[PDB]
């Protein structure tokens, strides 16, 4: 794992601060923060208003989130600056106390990128609860957002993360995912081949618990009652990871979490709607963004927009 | 299954006609029409603009579509009136020549409901090519759209379709679906248990051809290169069904169909975006629409808005 000083941010702190919001609180003075990191093509409220914002509130947290512009479609390394800055801020703002991080989709990749390349936050993140994270990207053009390139399997970014040690958990981590995910694949093996899998992680493939007939998609992986039970377990556990004893067959409910209002359940079902729209309307290019200098040593030989990464 | 006279429409014909559009042609005078029936929470153009409209155009058809208001969220029985009327009108408008129906999602349920309960179109539909149809609805709502009620497994509508013999093919039918469909389940068995399966149909579960490792979603079931090859097979086939010799493992590309222009591939992935939005902003009720008298005998004992379904 990389060590020593954090790399410099490409953005000034003021820009990164602008991406962070807490519910009814400022990041500098907040009780029991939980940092929520959104999915591709979404803002924090778009990913989480219908699910983990109100669910984490009922568990006694103050939900906070980042919304890197535009809708997480920009370079993943920049999205990660928002997350690293947010941890530094929320840690300092909650009495120098560790805080949990809860993510969806690209949000997990961002969290793990942050923990891999910015050592200062390793002591500040209590645990990670990632829903449908794509640490290996996805195998599922020239019409793609910067972060979609980086989330493509075999990308320079995913290569760098793996070579820097980022496929092993860095803090206590729970990963919840589905073999049937229609966005992130491969996920079928219930093993280290899966994109959501981290070594030493509590890797919960829904089919392993619920059976080989069980089906939930990419959005359900975040919003389901099953996901809530696993999520709650992870957040509550004294080990930092979800505990097998806290869930089972009877929790295998693929539909939106029971504690959500009827309105929130409908909105949770529609989770991927603004994401597709933002991708259609968003930035697109025909190459993968260059790696920042701190990441380049870990993907030598990969091709990005400027050319081949050199030693 | 039902035999005899078509039931009467609840909607005026002119209202039904207004929901029907053909590309660069009037339904009254069209050559080589294909009737496209959209998914829940979409219009015809929203379901097919980025896929089967230009692909059927490139295969030598005039794409026509119904867009039952509002966005296929109304009673599925009313949506079917649009389809049945469109068949009658497109059959007449093409010089009394049979036409193929191509569907996504609820559109397939609509097609089969039509063929089940309106006998006159049975002789007018050449074939059905249904992508991710939900004939048994889905196991995946007190504020839900009328058609969302009806597409829930165990609904009075799905009960009525089944008991009227509608889970057996009526015209030559191909059903292309995926075990991993995130909207329509169950689809996992490669067998009659699957929501997309019709007896005697050409039932193509993606994983049966592409392996148990193959994953494709509800939208991809319509838009993919794999789906295009299977669809092209069904349309061109002399039997009215897709032929196994026309596709294989090398066609197992889950990404948007190759022939599509670069902008059409982009919009293909965003297929469910208007759908999920319209569901939020459309009609909603706390009960399943009542079955129209022609369908009611097949779901006696079920519950709809007016209460328990009883014999007429």
UniProtKB/Swiss-Prot annotation, chain B:
InterPro entries: AB_hydrolase_fold (IPR029058), Stereospecific_Lipase (IPR053228). Keywords: Cleavage on pair of basic residues, Disulfide bond, Glycoprotein, Hydrolase, Lipid degradation, Lipid metabolism, Signal, Zymogen. One of its GO terms (molecular function) is triacylglycerol lipase activity. Its EC number is 3.1.1.3. The active site is at 105, 181, 218. It is an enzyme of class 3 (hydrolase). It catalyses: a triacylglycerol + H2O = a diacylglycerol + a fatty acid + H(+). GO terms for biological process: lipid catabolic process. Disulfide bonds join 22-64, 210-252, 287-305. The keyword Disulfide bond applies. Glycans are attached at residue 74. Hydrolysis of triglycerides. Is very stereospecific both in hydrolysis and in organic synthesis and has a potentially important application in glucolipid synthesis. This is Lipase B. It comes from Pseudozyma antarctica (Yeast).
């Amino acid at each position: 794992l990389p060590s020593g000083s954090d790399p410099a941010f490409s953005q000034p702190k003021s820009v990164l601060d602008a991406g962070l919001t807490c519910q009814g609180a400022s990041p500098s003075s907040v009780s029991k923060p939980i940092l929520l990191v959104p999915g591709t093509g979404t803002t924090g409220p778009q990913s989480f208003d219908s699910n983990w914002i109100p669910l984490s509130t009922q568990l006694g947290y103050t939900p906070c989130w980042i919304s890197p512009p535009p809708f997480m479609l920009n370079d993943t390394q920049v999205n990660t600056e928002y997350m690293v800055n947010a941890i530094t801020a929320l840690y300092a703002g909650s009495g120098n106390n560790k805080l949990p991080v809860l993510t969806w989709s690209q949000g997990g990749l961002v969290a793990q990128w942050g923990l891999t390349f910015f050592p200062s936050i390793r002591s500040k993140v209590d645990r990670l609860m990632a829903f449908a994270p794509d640490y290996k990207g996805t195998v599922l053009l020239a019409v793609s957002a910067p972060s979609v390139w980086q989330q493509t399997t075999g990308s320079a970014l995913t290569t760098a993360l793996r070579n820097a040690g980022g496929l092993t958990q860095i803090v206590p981590t729970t990963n919840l995912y589905s073999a049937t995910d229609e966005i992130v694949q491969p996920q079928v093996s219930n093993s280290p081949l899966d994109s959501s899998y981290l070594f030493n992680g509590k890797n919960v493939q829904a089919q392993a618990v619920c059976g080989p007939l069980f089906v939930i998609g990419h959005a359900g992986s975040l919003t389901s009652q099953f996901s809530y039970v696993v999520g709650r377990s992870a957040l509550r556990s004294t080990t930092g990871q979800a505990r097998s004893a806290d869930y089972g067959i009877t929790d295998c409910n693929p539909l939106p979490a029971n504690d959500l209002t009827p309105e929130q359940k409908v909105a949770a079902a529609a989770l991927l709607a603004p994401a597709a729209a933002a991708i259609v309307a968003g930035p697109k290019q025909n190459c993968e963004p260059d790696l920042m200098p701190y990441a380049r040593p870990f993907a030598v030989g990969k091709r990005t927009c400027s050319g081949i990464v050199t030693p």
